[PDB]
Design a binder for this molecule. Sequence first.
Ligand SMILES: O=C(O)c1ccnc2cc([C@@H](OCCCN3CCCCC3)c3ccccc3Cl)[nH]c12
Ligand SMILES: [Mn+2]
Length: 292
Amino acid sequence: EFVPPPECPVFEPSWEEFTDPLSFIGRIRPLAEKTGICKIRPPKDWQPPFACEVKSFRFTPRVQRLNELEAMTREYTLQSFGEMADNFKSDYFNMPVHMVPTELVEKEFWRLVSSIEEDVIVEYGADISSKDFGSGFPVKDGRRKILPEEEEYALSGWNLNNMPVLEQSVKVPWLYVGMCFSSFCWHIEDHWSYSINYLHWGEPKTWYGVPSHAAEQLEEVMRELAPELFESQPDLLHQLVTIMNPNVLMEHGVPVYRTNQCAGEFVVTFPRAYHSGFNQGYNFAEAVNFCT
Ligand SMILES: O=C(O)c1ccnc2cc([C@@H](OCCCN3CCCCC3)c3ccccc3Cl)[nH]c12
Ligand SMILES: [Mn+2]
């Protein structure tokens, strides 16, 4: 069975440390860059409202066949997607969705990825820009009303719309509506950028991270074990199908860290930190790459 990797660092900053994100990320860097990913829990009273246009939120999610690599050898609203997502998970595990242990979904996910006897297919609302129906965070752009008690979140530095995105030389957040077993494979960001991820609500998002000092080790294991048909593909195209069990990387000496990102918690990925993961159930996430 799947052996869970060690847990990545979790930080619970005080209200003083929560004042500036870039200053806090720079301070946790000596530890967090050695694990690739880290989790940040805001103070208990920091609860931003959900500001998406729920009435008109409509999308067609992508189809994900979990074992498509091993096999080589519908429009929804937010409500209707949640109904499908909860029905899928409760039927699959034969129990209420909130009662399924996170370790069981994790163990079953990686079994289905390498299973040729069972073909499980899920859907992922992963191609949703914040310009379509608004960001999950409140913003002061006029397109939606802002209550007085919500203005601090529209101006907060932890609002992903207020993160610095311009790199020095001579973009808006994206949304993810997940269900059980919907996943994203191993990849790094463009220009080796940072990324910050916020789970607005729903069941946890399970993460796996590799520190940047082991990036070549991971790419070497990929070169050895990924399907030969995709071996000569460039990294940008290969990372569309870089599905690999974390234990396989750990067996080859690649350090891997995990975490369960729960509602209201941040996940930061450091430069050139390979990461992957899957969703425990119906949830809503927002992500953006930022610069330091
Ligand atoms: O789903 C999440 O919560 C989540 C959390 C963190 N990072 C990501 C990245 C994705 C998705 O790709 C979007 C941008 C990728 N980019 C990287 C390299 C330059 C070109 C393209 C994705 C990737 C692979 C398979 C499925 C999906 Cl959906 N989803 C993520
Ligand atoms: Mn990413």
